[PDB]
Structures are given as C-alpha cells and as structure tokens.
Amino acid sequence: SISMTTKLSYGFGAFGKDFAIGIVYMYLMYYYTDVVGLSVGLVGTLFLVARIWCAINDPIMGWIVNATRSRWGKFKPWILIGTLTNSLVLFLLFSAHLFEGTAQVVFVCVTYILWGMTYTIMDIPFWSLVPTITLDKREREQLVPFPRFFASLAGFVTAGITLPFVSYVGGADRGFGFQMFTLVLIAFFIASTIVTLRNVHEVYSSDNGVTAGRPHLTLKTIVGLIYKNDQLSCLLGMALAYNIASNIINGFAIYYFTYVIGDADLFPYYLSYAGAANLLTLIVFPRLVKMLSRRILWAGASVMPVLSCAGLFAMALADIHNAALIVAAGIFLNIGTALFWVLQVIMVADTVDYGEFKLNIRCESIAYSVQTMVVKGGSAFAAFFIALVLGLIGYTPNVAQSAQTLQGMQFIMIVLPVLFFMMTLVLYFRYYRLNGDMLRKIQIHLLDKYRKTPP
C-alpha cells in the first residue's frame, strides 16, 4: 500500500536530515579545539548544558507541534522552518573562527545552543510522519528501514569524505573549508526537505476529522500523556537505558581510537566494517522480522553489543588488543544499533496508536518528542554516570593515576553498559506488549473507529 516513491522520498529526507548533523556530532570538538582554540572543559560543559536544554525543550516542541494548525498540516510547516533555521544556524556555528575573545565565546555559545533548539524543531515532526503513513505492522516494518538506512549512510559518508573536503577547499584555513562543506550539507538538506514535503503524504494523521485529535491541550495534560501512556513510559525507559549504554560504548571507542592505539591504520577498517554491518542489517530488516520475531530482534539488538562488550572485556583482561576483535565488536555493536533504531521508530508509532486506544487522544509529536528527549538525555546521563564513576574511583582530572586504577576504570566502563542493556531487556520483556495480537487489536480498533467517525 505504501508507494515506493513515498519510501524513497522519506529515505532521502532522512538522508538530508542526518547529513546536516553528523558533521556536528563528529567534528565540532575538532573544530572548536583544533581550529578555534577553546578549552576542552568549556566545550564539554557547553555540550552537557546544551543537551540538558534540548531534553527540556523537546516536550515543549511536542506541545507546539500538536497545537499547530496550518495548510500543510501540523508537521510540514515546522519541518520546513526547522530545516531552514537549522541550516542558517549551522553555517553560523562553523563561522566561529572569525571572531576572537569574549565576542567569540559568546558567539560559539549562542550558535551552538540555537543549533540544538533549531534541530529539535525539525526533528520531532519529521519522524512523527511515520505513524501517519501506514498504521499497519508489516507496512511499518518495511517502511522505516528506508529512512534508517539513509540516515546511517549519511553518517558514514560524512565520516568518510568530510575531512578530504575541508582539506581540498581552503587548505590551512580549516574554518573556510568547514563552512563550504557546511554549504554542501545545506544544499542536500534543503533538497531532501523539499522532497519529503512534496511526496510524503500523511494518511492517518491528527488534523483529520476522523483521527481523534485534541489540538487545544495544555503542557500539563500533554506531558501527562507520557505517564498515562504506560507503554510510552516503557519506551522512554528502554530507549534511555539503551542510549546511555551505547553512548558509554561510543565514548570508550573514541577514547581508545583517538588517544590510546595510535595506529591510524585501524580506524578506517573499523569504520568500514561497522558501516557495512549496519547498512546490511538495515537492508535486510524487512526480511528476518518475519523469519524472527519482533521481540527476538529487539533482544538481539541489545545482545549483540553485549557480546561486543564481553569481547573487549576479554581483550582488556589481556593486552593483545587484537584488531580482529575490535572490528568484530564494531560489527556486533552496529548490527545492534541498527536493529534498535528501526524497532524504536516502529515502536513509537505503535505507542501513539496504543495511546489513541487506551486513551482517546492521538498525539505523535509527543511520542517522538520522547524519542528525541531520550536521544539527548542518553548522552547527558552517560556523561553523568561516567563522572560519577570517576569521582567514586578517585579519578583526579588529568593527573598521574595508578595502573590498576586505570585498568579498573576501563573494566567498569565495559561493565556498566551491560547493566544498562540488561535493564532495557528486563523492561521490554516484563512490561512491553505491542508485538502481536495486541498490535492487530489496536489496528482494527482504530480503523473501525475512523470508519465510523464522520470525516
């Protein structure tokens, strides 16, 4: 029933959506420090505060999107505004190398936080289009792999050709090449936004006379829809734990690839094989959901990175530091993250549907606001837990540290993501219920309701 054109246009939309932020996530540290000359402490504090601010802003953006009424619906206008304003703020962000002194710092602080906010404006409604397109289990399963694959491909093409571009254009003057590549990103992002706005046509969307929308809602009642929707709360917990675990693992990988190994011959192969695994598991997700249960795929999504953690734990117990083990851990982690993200989008859709069922309110913006809130709070809480463990083990900041202290810090860093994954799976298998006959019950209920309600 889903137009192949719709799948591919939403995929290109996701490509442009993530191709504009991968550069930030991946090289804003290197820009701010190696090009602009700012203290690592300042940059880290800014990143933490901004992630907290975005997490708090997310539900406000959900309230805004839900209470919106326009010609193109309640999502497309905010999608366009977000893309445009975020492109502007991105270019301004990577133009920080011009100023100096307090003028620079202030600039850097404004742009960055604005960027965050702006992207939030763009992010929530985009994904909220998913539950308004299908409403069916298999259709969602074979829909969301397109955008997830395209997001991952954007991230990996960034990691691949973002530095060669900055080097070719400008040369020496790294800020200039950065802003030129930024313009490239702006072009792709706006093209993708136009594509998704024209082609993606929301079907079962709030705004429709039959879809049980309640636009005039308070912030109190809307944020209460999160707690009242017990399944959306389960999703909140699951995704928060999974994001904390994956952020801790990614920070460990960054630390051991940037500072420790020093063998620059490895990271290319690690990235290549990780991207291969991720894109392959995304391509083959429509298959294997029928071959293997939805629950089974969630379990595997969290278990594969647990295998990666165990492998690198064995690696740390010795000092072999085998590159084969590194690439295997990366492959497993990437398979897990792909499965997780696909199932997570499908589950946000399922949860907005279950909210319309249990309650009588349809609200996609809030569920995907929860998604983005959790995406940001994951990094926030991972940093919090790492600082907690450091203070507990007595990690003086960048001063001489015992050998066993460092090895134990590494071991506990390996361990606690396993705890978070066990938490995700406990919560899933004990409280989640949207994978079987329940899903079809919700579907038939909503479809019959729409059929009976006067349009």
Numbering used by the authors: 2 to 456
Task: Copy the relevant paper text.
The melibiose permease of Salmonella enterica serovar Typhimurium (MelBSt), a member of MFS transporters, catalyzes the symport of a galactopyranoside with either of H+, Li+, or Na+, which makes MelB as a unique system for studying cation-coupled transport mechanisms. The Na+ binding involves two negatively charged residues, Asp55 and Asp59 (helix II), and two polar residues, Asn58 (helix II) and Thr121 (helix IV). In this study, we solved two x-ray crystal structures of MelBSt, the cation-binding site mutants D59C at an unliganded apo-state and D55C at a ligand-bound state, and both structures display the outward-facing conformations virtually identical as published.
D55C MelBSt also loses the binding affinity with Na+ or Li+ and is unable to mediate Na+- or Li+-coupled melibiose active transport. Different from the D59C mutant, the D55C mutant retains the H+-coupled melibiose active transport activity, which excludes the role of Asp55 in the H+ binding. The D55C mutation selectively eliminates the Na+ and Li+ binding and converts MelBSt to a solely H+-coupled symporter. Here we report the structures of apo D59C and DDMB-bound D55C MelBSt mutants, which were determined by molecular replacement, modeled from positions 2 to 454 or 2 to 256 without a gap, refined to a resolution of 3.0 Å and 3.18 Å, respectively. In the D55C structure, the galactosyl moiety of bound DDMB exhibits a similar pose to that in the D59C bound with either DDMB or α-NPG. The densities of the 11-carbon tail were disordered and only 2 carbons were modeled. The glucosyl moiety pose is different from that in the D59C structure. The Na+-binding pocket in both crystal structures is nearly identical to the previously published D59C structures, with a Cys present at positions of either Asp55 or Asp59, respectively. In comparison with the Na+-bound WT MelBSt cryoEM structure, both the DDMB-bound D55C and apo D59C MelBSt mutants exhibited loosely packed side chains in this cation-binding pocket due to the absence of Na+ (the D55C structure was removed for clarity). The data support that the D55C mutant retains the H+-coupled symport activity mediated by the protonation and deprotonation of the Asp59 residue.
